[PDB]
From a paper:
To further investigate these lipid densities, we combined particles from all three States and carried out focused classification around this groove in a single monomer (See “Methods”). The particles clustered primarily to 2 classes that each contained approximately 40% of the particles and rendered 3.1 Å resolution structures. The overall protein organization of Class 1 and 2 is essentially indistinguishable. However, Class 1 almost entirely lacks lipid densities in the TM1-TM6 groove, whereas Class 2 has strong density for numerous lipids in this area. This indicates that our dataset contains a mixture of monomers in lipid-free and lipid-bound states, raising the intriguing possibility that the lipid trail aligns with the pathway for lipid scrambling.
The dual functions of [name] as Ca2+-activated ion channel and lipid scramblase raise intriguing questions regarding their molecular basis. TMEM16 proteins form dimers; each subunit comprises 10 transmembrane helices (TMs) and contains its own ion conduction pore surrounded by TM3-TM7. Ca2+-dependent activation involves direct binding of Ca2+ ions to two contiguous Ca2+-binding sites formed by TM6-TM8. Here, we report evidence for a lipid scrambling pathway along a groove harboring a lipid trail outside the ion permeation pore.
Numbering used by the authors:
A (entry chain A): 59 to 82, 91 to 147, 185 to 222, 232 to 423, 457 to 487, 503 to 638, 645 to 871
B (entry chain B): 52 to 149, 183 to 426, 455 to 489, 503 to 868
The structure:
Amino acid sequence: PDSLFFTDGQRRIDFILVYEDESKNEKQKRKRQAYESNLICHGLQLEATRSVSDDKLVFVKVHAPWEVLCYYAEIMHIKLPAPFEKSRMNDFYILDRDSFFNPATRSRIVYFILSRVKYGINRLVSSGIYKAAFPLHDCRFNYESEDISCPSERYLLYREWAHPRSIYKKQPLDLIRKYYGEKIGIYFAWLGYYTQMLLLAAVVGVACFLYGYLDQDNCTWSKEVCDPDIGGQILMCPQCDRLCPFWRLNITCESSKKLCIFDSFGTLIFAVFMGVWVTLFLEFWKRRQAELEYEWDTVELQQEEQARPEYASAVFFWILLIIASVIGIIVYRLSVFIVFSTLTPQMATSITASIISFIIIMILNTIYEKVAIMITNFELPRTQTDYENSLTMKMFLFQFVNYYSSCFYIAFFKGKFVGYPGDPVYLLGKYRSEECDPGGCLLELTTQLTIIMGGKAIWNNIQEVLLPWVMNLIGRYKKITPRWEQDYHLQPMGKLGLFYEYLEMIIQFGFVTLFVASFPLAPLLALVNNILEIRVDAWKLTTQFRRMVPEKAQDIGAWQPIMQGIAILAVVTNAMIIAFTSDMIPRLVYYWSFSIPPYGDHTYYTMDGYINNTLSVFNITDFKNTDKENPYIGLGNYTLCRYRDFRNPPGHPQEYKHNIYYWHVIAAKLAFIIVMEHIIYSVKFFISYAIPDVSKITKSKIKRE
Amino acid sequence: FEEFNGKPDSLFFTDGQRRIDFILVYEDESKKENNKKGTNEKQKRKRQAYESNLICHGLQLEATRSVSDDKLVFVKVHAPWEVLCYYAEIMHIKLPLKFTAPFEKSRMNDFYILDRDSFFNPATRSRIVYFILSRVKYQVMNNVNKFGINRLVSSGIYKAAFPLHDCRFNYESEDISCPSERYLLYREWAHPRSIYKKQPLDLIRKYYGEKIGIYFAWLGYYTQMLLLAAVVGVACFLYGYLDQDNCTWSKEVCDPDIGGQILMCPQCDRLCPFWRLNITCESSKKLCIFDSFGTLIFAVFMGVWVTLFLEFWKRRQAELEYEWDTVELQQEEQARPEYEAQLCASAVFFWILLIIASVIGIIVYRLSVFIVFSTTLLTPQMATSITASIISFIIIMILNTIYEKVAIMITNFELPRTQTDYENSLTMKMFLFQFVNYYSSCFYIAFFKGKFVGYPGDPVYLLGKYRSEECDPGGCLLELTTQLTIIMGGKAIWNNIQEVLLPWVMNLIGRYKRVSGSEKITPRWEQDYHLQPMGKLGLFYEYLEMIIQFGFVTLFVASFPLAPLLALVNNILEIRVDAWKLTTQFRRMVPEKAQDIGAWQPIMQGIAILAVVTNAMIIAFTSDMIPRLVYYWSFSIPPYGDHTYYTMDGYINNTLSVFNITDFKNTDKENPYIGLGNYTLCRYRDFRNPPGHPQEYKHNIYYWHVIAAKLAFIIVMEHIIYSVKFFISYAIPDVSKITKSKI
Ligand SMILES: *[C@@H]1O[C@H](CO)[C@@H](O)[C@H](O)[C@H]1NC(C)=O
Ligand SMILES: [Ca+2]
Ligand SMILES: [Ca+2]
Ligand SMILES: [Ca+2]
């Protein structure tokens, strides 16, 4: 009959026990009998029905009597289904005595009852005393509940909020929490608001990108890089020793023209904007958190102590952090190296290197997860919440290093401290430092960033959950068993599913916020991913997993400190990216200072001759201070070559030393860093303190009541 | 009512069994008043209604006629138990137990009740009676209720209302039973004869309540931390002083063969001539004293010290909050709308006034220096600096009162809803005004003095005819130190003298207006009526002065390592000064309770945050350590220098720039130099290319090297300091472990 009620009886099930009979080594049967007798004596109903499919598997079900169940529910601080008390029985309207309770809360109370009893959930499940135990879903998600009394909340919830037919509709948070629990509701609300503000971020980013894209005609330095009589005549020095010849500058028109898009004033404006956008996001999330705290029953008290089966060396963890970061850097370096040792060509090279690095990161993620689990379990935590917090911190640190090591290397430690061709830097010995092209490494930073974000999102939840949908779409266009057996045939979601989902969104937030300067279109990718992910998570949760007992929570949890830390780090990261990764500061300094008769020869500020007047000069006769075999020998009548660094020309009294322009530029860079950081922090503080002038609605009405 | 009994010190009713709690003082109609007898009718009717309501509510009260003046009538008060217990229950007043609750009659037997009248301390009785007096209503006119004892005095119905002191501070109470605890407080706490013994905060709380005990405990903890700071600062200064044989650049400046030959270049237009660098040997030695690595050590030590002070203060606050069992009363909070009450324009106008205040401060300092220099024609230069600082401080003190008055008027235009709103608005506005007024000159000296003046060929004028002033080769750090020490010391001395004197002289005037030959013994209430009132603001000005002192100690310590010693002397005097003025020259303030110091806490956190920026900027720009280090590490070497190994030798000569006298352009005042015709080139403090050269007088490589070093130092210092402070805040539990046990 696929009913939710006891056999031939009016009694609503709330939780199921399934055990494997040993009668087809009696210790397991003895433990089972003891547990069952204890449950019977403690005042719970029990009924067993054998599944037709497997005679070995025998299922057991329970119920909830009003008196004892309500008493134990009042045992802990439970509000209206304001601790429960018969003295306020008629204060609140009640239409019936058998259904007024929320079935989710009934399941939660029964689960707590089972947890408190001892002798079994943990030990019996782990050791095989009981195969599994879970509550029931209202009905099949395909078709409405056959029983009229059932509201078929699962059917409506699926059809309205899980199927991608409702991709555009609004999020029904009330049903989400009233069916699943407070944790799921708060997670989905946070995800929704995050998408909402990602919309504004995406609009602003698109505006800036268009502003850049319409400036291609007025991008002087790229034009000069292309004009053959200027770009082609420049002969750059080789970037390696034994496998690179002298190259003309104009071979990088495509790179420079693309780079002028992501290296314009629009990016600077967008970085400044995101600086305050992050603060606004935090402030309004506190708004919404207060609002949900008021509107929902989020005033549940916390128990002082909890029990766990397990009831410094932290330096070892940080050593693992260091080795992980070093491994990531070596992985990226080796990937680019192997792709090298073998219009599009350089772009395809960069894309392939990024793809290989992303693959290696994907493999490394599982290993890092396993080692984090092992090490944290070796610590013997006292409780469960502390266990989750320790996992959050350690897992997040591993993911952070594993995913951002290559990006940090590209941004900062690539082409920054390479000496002039006369005395190259071999920091470790026989390991030369890589150099960026004259434009900079910003373009490959953007390529790595976009490839990683895309690949991760697309491959992960997206692709894993999405095969059947595309299969059915292509197909279209181009024995009856009770509910408990069906739910048994499902698979559980474990105890870390919500943790993993939050981890994914937090990694996405880090990608969007940290390196926003390089890639102004990142918010658009994040928005698309979120719009799909909300429905993917909803569908998987409501279709492919057993029902989870609702829990009580008031905030996302351990992540808010991580969010604010990410914001405080992101401001400085963006400042450093604009200062060092990009070549906007040298360009501005040249335009304002070195185009004037004292140093230049133009009658007015202009960008003409920036490329020629910026690149340095090197002499072959001074090939090396070590005076060994040199790659400069022969190879034509070449006598002078140029390199991307600010040093005095040969013959100057300060031979091959940093010149005035270098120090002017570095001073400008440091001034920009300090001014931008101070202004952004000041605005952050003002906005945070302006809660009364920003947030007069939510707190006022929440305190009014 | 009934006449004077004959026992002066007695604080009881004429029977001797009822303890007084308040004295209401009104002016009778017995005289021949003028204007309206109707005004007298209304005043007497209102007074009668209020007294009738109070006597109905359950408070006894009997009056008496003053012996000296016939027109003075004193009205006593008294609260029997029943009303006392009921109102304590309404107030959530807790009593000593022996899992904690306020006082209720239902649990009357559950408390350690000692005696009829003794179980309740007089301070709490006074507070309860004060609330009873405040909440009551007396009449309704224009269909709108009129209530509040405060309004009666505001409109002039009552002269005053106050509790009573135990007995004379300088003699014991004639009544044996009386504790005379005022006597003990005077003997031990006030009366600087006990300058050293630790102040008994418990008795202070008992007598004057928590509102005063919190302030005095804060001051004591402040003083101890200043002892630590003064020891460390004296150590740093002593090291700087004993290390002078190795201050090379000062030796070069003083040396007649190096410094003497440097023919510097005139600063002014034509009122000051050429001069030789060796005339600044005294200033060079002073800067060696004040501008050593000890200054950096003290800057970083103070950066840590401010945070440590804040955290330990939080721990002490928690400890005291538990010890004085203020949790339930702190939770029980209710605010009453102001008795006086019945856009962004106010804020913007306030900000404009702030800007003009800053400009006025800068201008007054500049004019003081200018006039002290003009009047010219034991070092003459230092004498001039001291004089300038003296006039600057005089003008600052004069302008402080005007700024206080303007703040009061501005905050009065806006109508804060309750007393707390008014107090917080006043706190913010007064702090901003005092900050700007006191520190505008110091900020100018530190950051805007001799920083954007061009080379002599093309002098920089701010807006015309106003040439920018510039420092000597060493810098203006010594000028800043002189300004700071003079202003801080003068503020301390003048403020302490004013605090000690003004109430005393007012009391003396009042007494000399009553030289009537009483030659008798007079009652307690009548004698306590003559003391000063301690206007409703209260400890606001005390907190303000202490906050300004802390700002001086912390913000600018990078230029004056001896500031904590001056602060220590000031505070060890101020403890007893404030105690004496509060115990011997003022009527008993009504007790209350407070969570913390008040609105000042955000001010202190802001000051601590901005101190790091101020110190970093001072060391980077005001001082000259950074150019010295740059020269030592990167310009005494073959690429630019000549010395084989790093050294400070030849720093003065190799740094001072050059200028060719005939190269003066511009048509106005063509003859600032050519008059003498002695030489053809002068040296000035700036990094620019020498004559000739493709870029004649543009900034050279050394300038940009130095600027980059300065900015890098700022970044590194700010980041490390803030990171260390954040980590320290995270690590400190912020509550005592013992208190964690007790709670
Ligand atoms: C670069 O310049 C050289 C000579 O100026 C030339 O012939 C070539 O076509 C230009 N473009 C590329 C992509 O090499
Ligand atoms: Ca997912
Ligand atoms: Ca004082
Ligand atoms: Ca004082």
